[model samples]
Target: ASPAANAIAYIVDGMGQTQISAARYLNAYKTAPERFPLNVSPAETPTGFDAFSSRGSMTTFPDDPYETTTDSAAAATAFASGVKTYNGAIGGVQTSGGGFQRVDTVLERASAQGYATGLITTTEATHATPAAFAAHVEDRGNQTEIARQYIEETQPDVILGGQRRDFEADASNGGTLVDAARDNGYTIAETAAELDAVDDPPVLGLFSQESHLDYYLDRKNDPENTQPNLDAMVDAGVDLLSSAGDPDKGFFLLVESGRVDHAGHANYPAQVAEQYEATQVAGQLVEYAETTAEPTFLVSTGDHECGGLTLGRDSPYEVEYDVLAAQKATTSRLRDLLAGVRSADELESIVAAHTGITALTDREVAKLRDAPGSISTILAERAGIAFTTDGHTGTDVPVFAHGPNAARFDAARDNTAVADALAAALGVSL
Candidate 1:
């Protein structure tokens, strides 16, 4: 393959047809909503994405013919490593006659070429999506082991986003992988401001201890939060990766807004859900692409669609698009709030205040009052969105590309094609 440009994968997890439509509906209301306060909104499409790139669609199903729907690990592995493994498989393939197979990812090859590599995601650094790009393992549950591989194997030039607990070197003492990271010249950034001050290369930016980054809705309300938003992280990640431009090999980076899937799972009824946050960060990538001087290629799409998110409901025959903006907190954030509440009165008021919906019944109130193993139907109802499956669907996802040979994505393609496209852009074969 002939070398072309530096490659960037802006993977938007679970942004499918319904999610985009709903997000688009809410986004169009932005100009008219001066009378109403809102936290996040979408980028009205056609005009919105057209400003960014030529777009197309891709089949997101796993390589396995027996697989009904693809999981994040499987879908990400297909796009990241050019192999479609089982639902739980990470960074590898499934053997028909045997157990499994490990494959070299584009990130690994890029690193070998002396090209700088980075992983910036809303999810944990070692979580499935980013992990498949940077490390090889059979199962996605191997997060702890994956974090170790990140330290000893892949060692991308820049690693940013959540899951600090995975990187801790000591569980008993709450120590971090910082010692080893520093040993490798990796600057450690615990806060967004620290990341801004990092004039050094090979940075390790871990900003959250949660399973993932704060929900976009929650973070917007959290003025005290030091963790950077997905957009900010992308801005910083790009700058750090482009440092010195080196002009030598350029760089390869993967940025994922994983919460579209999270929001889909939450399926907050009658709300914009994570779709707003998804488009917001995607818009950031576009802005970065617009300003960058180096010859760069960017591919943006989802690993899979969850929730079968719908844009409309009948009965009244209205979309209630404004309610999307009314969502001040994600379901996860509500639970965080719920977990801290001392009384039923406090909990009920908190839920009602954050949700702006009255559907929470006496039963639901008591459930919250008593606490939960996992807040279920009530949480979704509170958010005002309904989901079909509460997980990934078998639906094919979409792909959009920009820069040299970007037009090649105009037609329908496969998940493996996404990986190959980046490899082709990087002047290599996966």
Candidate 2:
């Protein structure tokens, strides 16, 4: 199967079948429907991946001999390069001689063909998922170097995400990737307003001072935040990529909803639902594919499943989902606020103020002091959500697709098959 012009690979990190199911039920009936923010009509039931025209599943195991479960870097490399590498590898693979081999990603191939290429994410621009698309590094933790590559080497037409600190000048490393970007003809945008005003390509948007953009719940709770959401970033990427190159040449863009993985790692169900909902707007890419004169292939899937999340727990026939909806803060946020507080009253007050979980027993309060994740455990138990592990699970993730040659992804396949199909769609041989 082949396509004519553009290609888009949308990734929702750590989102598995049960994650989408929990989010659907929470958005459709348990929580505020308006918060879900889908473009579908009311008659259309609320959903996550179910909205795609073609649906399938994919195995996510990596090339690492010691590990069975895949990390974001390896999974993303599979999607970007059609090759599996070690867990920590980013856009490169290990050699038998213990050296690194840089692989050309689909985005780089598209760029060589004169197509505008971009990477967008809710995590750092140089994070595993986004970096795998454009930057080549043996280790994913070398993010500062990855930022340099994005600014000086690959230089995608649009780099919209967080990790402002990685691009900044530090005492240890006097070099600044942001300044390099400015010199290389990029319009640097650090706020949503600035990103909104920009109407061109070669834009670098760093909306967070740290590694990741704020969680959806955090942004929603704080109205003063100027961070651009995933939708806004995707909107900018689409508009700019569309015009940056010749219309006939088209473009390639990868949008990643990264924080869903963070939420899953924390075992926070409410945050997971909100974060997954935040990425639902990626569905608009399908609309773009269907409406555009030029053929555009869109594929979306998760790198791996996290938290071993289950919908039902012991002795509970019903999930108390409304309780999850009432929670206003993510587990990460509450952990910070509860860091040094010793008074049980203060603990209860803080938990109640943020989570609306006023029924904290003495045992739970003690556990909160000992382990911050107790908040997630309490909430999970209340919501009838059980987690087998706090880390990623070795499970198949869902794949959803639309547009030209999307049927190539309609059957169960390996993660690398996705990259191969998208490469074919863009007429770029991988």
Candidate 3:
């Protein structure tokens, strides 16, 4: 099978309907507007389908009024069953006690049939996305149960992400999640070096203890000591899953660009740009799938949208929130420019060389000169948008899919509809 026919699905967290449209406009302007794909178009405002319009096709589901907090459980349950659920439930069952709808995930079936299954995320492996595939729990926050489930059931071929704390017992107990994985025949890796060194058939990697690895800016500035990156984990998963001559069985892998939501929540333009750049790592996975002859599926969607980010707002001045422009000067770039410079004149030259702001205003340059950090905060104050707070929105998020089963997902659908479609694509009854 051609890699182009392989199916890949991405679920970006906190991507609501509004942000999806906003992102489409931003992507159109960032790339060549004329080069936009025909299958993709602007969808309804305040509609997840509208965001999907620009990617492929989309189908919208009935709005579940209770879809946040507790409703999330219902949503996850419905997601697992392809049926509507109350908010905050998981695995097709309401936390209040309805039994699981008896539908197996695509990954579970693929694994049972001898194909390899892998999960790559910026959040903990026990997080909602990974848990949805393997665990049966009413509460997504049941980290201990989730961890135990990953060890006991589903036993995926590859698992990589953050939040090592979730796997560990009390400090005095030493019964860490890694120990359990090791006991269960998984090769545990704690660092990038260890991850790469693993030749084991099944592996569990916990690269960070919480949230995700540092943003690109932080990693670039401190490359040698910075945290692991998404690309590296993807590379490792690809290697492990495709190894051992099991092409006939195929493979199902999920890779998430999770932090884009975080940056959006903070309304940090620079961080968001860096997070988007981080997603280019996912683009590499797309390329790899194409190169391989196996059937792969790649779909990218969000759990919901956050931040209501908008461009070209009619404010006092006609200012453009050019996120990419603000982050063009990465941390590494600035650090390299300042190397070997000690004097004020030398430092000033370094800043000017890297930032391309030759004639900085007196006040702007003064702030930069006085600041200890390489990057200036003035850029944010000048071009950034105001944010109410770091919170998730109730809007629908976009879903982008490519490869096998992509057609089934092209039309707008609810988040749970995704799980239903996957079940159908994989020939499972959910």
**Candidate 3 C-alpha lDDT tens digits along 1-430:** 2332223455556555444434443444455535443323443222222222235433323234544432334444444456655444455543247544444566676566666778887767777766777676756678777777777677888888877777775322356667777777999877888888898758888877776665555554444643567777878888787764655455667666566566666565444454354445546756775687655656666665556554434365433334444344544345455555556666666556544344556564455455534343454345444444466555555566555656665566766666666555454455
lDDT of 2 by residue, 147-232 (tens): 88888788899999987898885322345777778777889999999999997668999998897888887766766788987777
**Which candidate's lDDT is highest?**
2
- What's the residue-level lDDT of 424 in candidate 1? 83
Error of 2 at 181 (Å): 0.4
lDDT of 2: 0.82
Cα RMSD to the true fold for all candidates? 4.1, 3.6, 6.6
- The local distance difference test score of model 3 is 0.57
Which residue runs of candidate 3 sit more than 4 Å off their true CA positions? Answer: 1-7, 16-54, 57-81, 95-103, 170-174, 314-323, 326-381, 384-389
Candidate 1, 245-288: lDDT as tens digits:
45647889998887777767766542354566666666666666
Model 3 TM-score, all chains together: 0.73
The better candidate by TM-score, 1 or 3, is: 1
Worst 10 residues of 2 by lDDT: 33-42
- lDDT, candidate 1, equals 0.74
Select the stronger candidate by TM-score from 2 and 3: 2
